[PDB]
Design an enzyme around this catalytic site. Sequence first.
Site, PDB file in Angstrom:
ATOM      1  N   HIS G 151       0.800  -1.217   0.000  1.00 56.75           N
ATOM      2  CA  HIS G 151       0.000   0.000   0.000  1.00 56.75           C
ATOM      3  C   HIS G 151       0.835   1.269   0.000  1.00 56.75           C
ATOM      4  O   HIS G 151       0.286   2.351  -0.236  1.00 56.75           O
ATOM      5  CB  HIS G 151      -0.929   0.035   1.212  1.00 56.75           C
ATOM      6  CG  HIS G 151      -2.070  -0.926   1.131  1.00 56.75           C
ATOM      7  ND1 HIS G 151      -3.117  -0.761   0.252  1.00 56.75           N
ATOM      8  CD2 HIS G 151      -2.335  -2.054   1.830  1.00 56.75           C
ATOM      9  CE1 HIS G 151      -3.976  -1.751   0.407  1.00 56.75           C
ATOM     10  NE2 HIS G 151      -3.526  -2.549   1.358  1.00 56.75           N
TER      11      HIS G 151
HETATM   12 ZN   LIG Z   1      -4.042  -6.392   2.676  1.00 58.72          ZN
END
Ligand SMILES: [Zn+2]
Lengths: 549, 183, 156, 19, 375, 151, 384
Positions: G151
């Site tokens: 992320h």
């Molecule tokens: Zn994840």
Amino acid sequence: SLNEEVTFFEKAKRYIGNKHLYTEFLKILNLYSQDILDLDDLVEKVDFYLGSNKELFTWFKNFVGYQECEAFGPSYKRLPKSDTFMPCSGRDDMCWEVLNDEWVGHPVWASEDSGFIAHRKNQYEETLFKIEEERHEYDFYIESNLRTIQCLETIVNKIENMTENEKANFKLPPGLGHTSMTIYKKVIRKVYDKERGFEIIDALHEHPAVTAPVVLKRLKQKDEEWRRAQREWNKVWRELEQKVFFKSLDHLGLTFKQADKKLLTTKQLISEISSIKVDQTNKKIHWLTPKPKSQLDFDFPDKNIFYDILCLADTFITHTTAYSNPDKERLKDLLKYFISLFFSISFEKIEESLGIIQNRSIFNLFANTNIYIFFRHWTTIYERLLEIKQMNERVTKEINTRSTVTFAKDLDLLSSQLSEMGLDFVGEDAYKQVLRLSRRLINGDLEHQWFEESLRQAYNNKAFKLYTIDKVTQSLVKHAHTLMTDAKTAEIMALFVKDRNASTTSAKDQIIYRLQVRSHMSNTENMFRIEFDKRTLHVSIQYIALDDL
Amino acid sequence: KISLQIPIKLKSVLVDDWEYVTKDKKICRLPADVTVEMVLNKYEHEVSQELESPGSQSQLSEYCAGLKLYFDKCLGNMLLYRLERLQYDELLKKSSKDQKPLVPIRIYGAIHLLRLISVLPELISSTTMDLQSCQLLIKQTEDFLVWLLMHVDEYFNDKDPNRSDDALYVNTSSQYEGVALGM
Amino acid sequence: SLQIPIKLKSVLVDDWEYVTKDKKICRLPADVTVEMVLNKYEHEVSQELESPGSQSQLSEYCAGLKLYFDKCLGNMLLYRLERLQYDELLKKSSKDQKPLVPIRIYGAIHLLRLISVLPELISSTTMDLQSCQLLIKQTEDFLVWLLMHVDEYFND
Amino acid sequence: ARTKQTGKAPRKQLATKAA
Amino acid sequence: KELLEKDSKGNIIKLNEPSTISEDSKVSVTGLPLNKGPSEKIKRESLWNYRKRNDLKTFLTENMTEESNIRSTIGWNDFENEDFCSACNQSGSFLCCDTCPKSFHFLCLDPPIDPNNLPKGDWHCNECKFKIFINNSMATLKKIESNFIKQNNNVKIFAKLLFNIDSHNPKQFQLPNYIKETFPAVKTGSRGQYSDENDKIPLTDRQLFNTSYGQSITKLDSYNPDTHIDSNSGKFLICYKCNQTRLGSWSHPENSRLIMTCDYCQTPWHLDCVPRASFKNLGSKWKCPLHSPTKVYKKIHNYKVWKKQRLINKKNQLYYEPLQKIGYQNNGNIQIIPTTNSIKYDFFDKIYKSKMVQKRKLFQFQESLIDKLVS
Amino acid sequence: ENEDFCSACNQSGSFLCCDTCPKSFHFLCLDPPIDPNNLPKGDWHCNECKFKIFINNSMATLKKIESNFIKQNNNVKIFAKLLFNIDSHNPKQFQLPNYIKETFNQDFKITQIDENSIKYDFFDKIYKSKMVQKRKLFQFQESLIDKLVSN
Amino acid sequence: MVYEATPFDPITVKPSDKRRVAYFYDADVGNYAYGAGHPMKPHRIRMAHSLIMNYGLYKKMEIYRAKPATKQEMCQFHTDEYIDFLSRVTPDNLEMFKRESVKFNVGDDCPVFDGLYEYCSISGGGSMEGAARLNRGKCDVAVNYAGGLHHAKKSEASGFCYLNDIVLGIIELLRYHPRVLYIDIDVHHGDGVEEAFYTTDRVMTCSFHKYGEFFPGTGELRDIGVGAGKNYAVNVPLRDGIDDATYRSVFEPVIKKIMEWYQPSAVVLQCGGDSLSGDRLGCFNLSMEGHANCVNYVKSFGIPMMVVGGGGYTMRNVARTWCFETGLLNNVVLDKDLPYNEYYEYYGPDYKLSVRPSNMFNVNTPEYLDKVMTNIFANLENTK
Ligand SMILES: [Zn+2]
Ligand SMILES: [Zn+2]
Ligand SMILES: [Zn+2]
Ligand SMILES: [Zn+2]
Ligand SMILES: [Zn+2]
Ligand SMILES: [Zn+2]
Ligand SMILES: [Zn+2]
């Protein structure tokens, strides 16, 4: 080549239906006509408008003249060249070629400045996460302390076998010769005081000879105390995990009682059959000219399940107290008579297990709402038990061949509940056991929570639909009781008795039976056609409410 | 009570600005291809020709110079949203790096001038300025607005920043948005 | 913004000389009347106009014209000694019980009179922008269609 | 110069995995 | 407290351990310190019942871990101030005016103040600085205003406007009401942000986090059949594309297909007929695939964008009906009118006539095409 | 109440004094060529005066009636606004015009359109686009044929 | 007519596909904690690792302790100021950094613990060393569970991810491989890795993720990349409660079409444990078998690959599934009976390797998945 050309617009207007949608369709057509909308966008919009009408959309496609980039997507925007020029010192030409620095996305932009929806969890799952939180808390602190003890004892055994003439100026680098710079700092700052942890660190770095052994001794004392507290905490965590875990993994079964109370009613069962009839009538005008004479289909591959449901019904009848004993025996022989007459099972098998159309095999029962709801409850119990039976052999082989691990037996970790009190399924057939347990739940000698726990432990939460077996068989008993003791309802049964007993009937007999049934019920009530086949035991339920009128 | 008759095309332009800055989180491409000083100047050259009356020429030049001085002094005071204030800060730091004092008059585009025209009646109503001067200021503002309508296709064009590098608006980064609306 | 070739301009001032400086006027049936010229107008241009919407607005133009020549001949398109002419035309119409419509009795001269008075009259009332270009384009292609065969109807 | 906070360091915590 | 007891020559002798008991009883995530175990009051409900081998292969890892540095990039490659900003009316880190109860954002000032290069002494707002300059200045305000007017002789009309904004504290720009009131669809958010008809009502905290486990607003965790049935009519929500409502049967809930309604025209659509995987509970209002777009991009073959005009209240909005029916070049902003027999036959004949016109256009050309080849 | 010259024919003659407007007309300078010594007895309203008493000198009634009279006859639609001016025109001689003697709420207007006209422009646009692409491919084919013949 | 409902076949290894396995583990990576109330816990790595050792698995592989990444190496994808801030921030001097706190999102979701720079360095060094060992042919499968921070982005930290080590691993693979395929079976969308390689055709990023009002909101079906990376970023949106058979029937045809169409030279596999059943933040219903069939199917192709573990917030399930992945990569199937590890008390009450799926609704209908994979297959025709 002319008539469809002039009639296409109002034929499409009939298809679109809602005027509004037709208004936006005309807006789409004008937007194409004003050199504003591209032809592909018009084609897609009409595809979303007249997708199910293949012929009309095919005509539009060929008459319009469609022959079969820059799709950026909704979650990415382009930065200018000013914000791209941000120095990344490690990038050579390949990273500057293959990495995207102009198109970016964010959770805030993708949320449309609204937020995100977290997944809902059980309170058992929440306390499982709390147990896991405390476990990670204790184990992280203990293992960090143990790593610092290993490093400190390496330093201590290095410093023990040397003399004192160079022990005065012996120093230690940051990290104490280890691969980490901060783990020992965390351990020191936790174990000692906040303000004194930094000065202990400085005393260890400058003068490790005197500070290192007392630091190692404290850390070892803190380690053994933390491990004792962790073990006698681990007892509590293990017992709470055994209490909580299988309920936490049950998702539909935790709310199945309220859902079965709400959705196994008369209104929802009428709604399902009416929705299927509405779907068939809506798709009849588009295609499928042979419209089916049935809406719901039920299969009955096993006949022992009928005896199981009958045994559960008589168990509820013997257990209950709100009904009189003549009413109890009328329920018993009414259920036995209906099961023996509707299906191919004889009364002897039930007792020992607990245009003339001649030699007919298809038998029609015309019913009002009461008989339909009673039959729907019976099919609900039958499918709920058939889901258990069709996987009974595999779950029996899984439960019988349950090889527990050795270190749990040696350290008595595995739970003992569901055993001393006899709720495991080891040594018995799984289906029989369920019925036995159920019967015990119906009789009131068994708690609901232990029954649910035994089912979810034995079947790995796949028997969640049997949590309310007593309530549904109670509702089935109540529906049979109102089935024989209602005016204009028992006469329909009797008519079904005459129709089933007298075989070799023509079509006109079926018609006059239909209007004779209708007579008993109001001209507003609902007609149900329950068709049974002697071969393969298939039941087709058809919704003809206010149709034959 | 002071009223201004802004034409609804420029009202929709201002509302689209508000949409792009506050909802879509888009800032102005700075320095713009068409700035405020530029537009004001063009306005003058255009109208000055039409009007011969020399007192009208003096007024028009007075109004243009006063709008320039008012803009620069008020741009960073009440003319820009919270999202663009970090762009104002980085412009100030870039100007102080080059030892040139910042002049909003030549860095900002005509949308901020339209913001000034829209917010002008409130500022006029907040000062002790007499009625005839207020009326003539409103009157020259209406002449500027009806001049802007004829040139609304070359000063306020609609272009997607994801497709055109020459759009008046540019998309933001998470970092900018963060520092702008987080601290 | 309408353009009228001298071919027409010369013949309309010559007709002006006939109606002002001379007693000679148009005939009682006015030889070729307006239905045949407008019907052959649609029969060639709508057969030359390509898209069906163009033929739709062509039909409208002619029909509208027809109604405008019906509703406008008594107000604008009259000269001296023509009032009396339209007077015994309406007195003759009332004799045979068929009503007075001015299209089947008149000729093309007061048609191009009507497009001659058209641009000042089109600016008298409130009108669109682009409806004016549609109307002037229809008048121009009607007048050039006349300019192909002026000598058919306009020979003394 | 006296300063005060609000005390959340990041922004739009609502649009995050753990808020 | 004399941690290192050095000798007379500076040599180390012995150190004293600090107060370990200062934070030995800190509350952990268990609710109890790590020194002690669980209490009995949680052991009642934690345990089932409360009545008041070392063959590890995990210590051999360090022997078989070989270091890895074979990468190509190895080596080198008094009054309390307010809780909201006085400029933007939003919370955050503030610089506080000393002699004024207003607080500002660090980026909201003229000029914006760096959050590390703070003023060393006292900081005043622009209004407070103007107040101190007036109190300081012997001349009355109107005297200073007149002196600024005659000093700025080159501009007279804006001279009062130039003067009076030095007293004004900096504020975030907000559009005036008469700019916003002409568009009734455009609203103002809680933070002053833009909002319009394509924006949902924000769901309150009760609906998202304070619901039961079975009933979730995502409508994905349970079988909810009270979504295919219209609330105000009682009929079934027929999906537009499949022309069906897949209600399911509660014995086979996997046969039930999820259905939503459009947020503008209330057209029900299945979640599989339109490719979607959620119910758009929060955010912008979902628009069914059937509406006309308010913004389109077309290829020039650059590009040309088109946006629909915003809605205007009935006072400032006038609707006009074209005189020209065929070919009226509108801008795309259109409104439809109701219809008030001969039109159908007129259309029919127009299409007929135009079709033999197209046929004769094809024939008069193909003859020239085949007559070209002989020469 | 009267004028020395006829406002229609621009010469003197037998006049008829209208009640409100001072303009007077001849016995042939009207939409009826009114026969002398046979005029129906009354106040002698002209066209403009009868328009004023028909509309009662009020705006909104005449606007809704223009809307109505444009509404029924859509077959004369492009001339429909032009049909009122005669009823508000006092008739006159053909005054030959000058070039014939020789030799802001209005910006956001929503078009009010019917479904038939949208249908017509859709058919218009598809037929134009289809046959200009057909023609251009036919011209490209002929051009390649001529180029291959010449080569 | 693309989606076929297939029952979940039992997992079988291929004896003709033996791979040299290099497993990367630093012993310090378990001694970092995100926070007191925080779900991301790096400690779940080492009881994964303790399941490897105790399963003797280690023997079948080569254990390495990768050199931690430096600042410049880190700046191969991230900016200089973000890496500086990451190397300079501590929970002590947080009041020195507020502008960088909102600038880089460090704070709250991604907290500030004093072993932040070391944990990020361990993860990044593990990823780059695994990619290097794949480049030089020293191993066929590189395993590094310390990373997986998919992320993280160029100048921000999100999703409990500070350093996008997967981008550095793919970058190091790109120096020796022309085409690299990244497959993200995390329940979240791999927004950082897809955003990093959005405009390139050299990296294809296929992400099987839940797409609702779920984090990070990106990964919608129309997101197929722009510029030269058009149709080179496949997003598979899934609904809640997808089980093993359904996940197999969406994963195997899509990955098969990628192999026979994109034809990559190297594979990176983000093995998120948050896609398992019973996860704290995940909303899928995958058992261990269902999580492991994806890795077995991608191992069947024979492409040099790098298995990197990412999410997973319940430590027992992600550790058991990572041990089963590591066992499957040595062409063995570990028995469902745990040996004695030090963290044995976590895996109650049965103490078996299996992660039991929940009985929640498989709301992913066959028609929706058929439409999704039909659109994906139509977009994949341009990757030849
Ligand atoms: Zn994840
Ligand atoms: Zn102050
Ligand atoms: Zn502020
Ligand atoms: Zn809609
Ligand atoms: Zn549907
Ligand atoms: Zn006269
Ligand atoms: Zn009069």
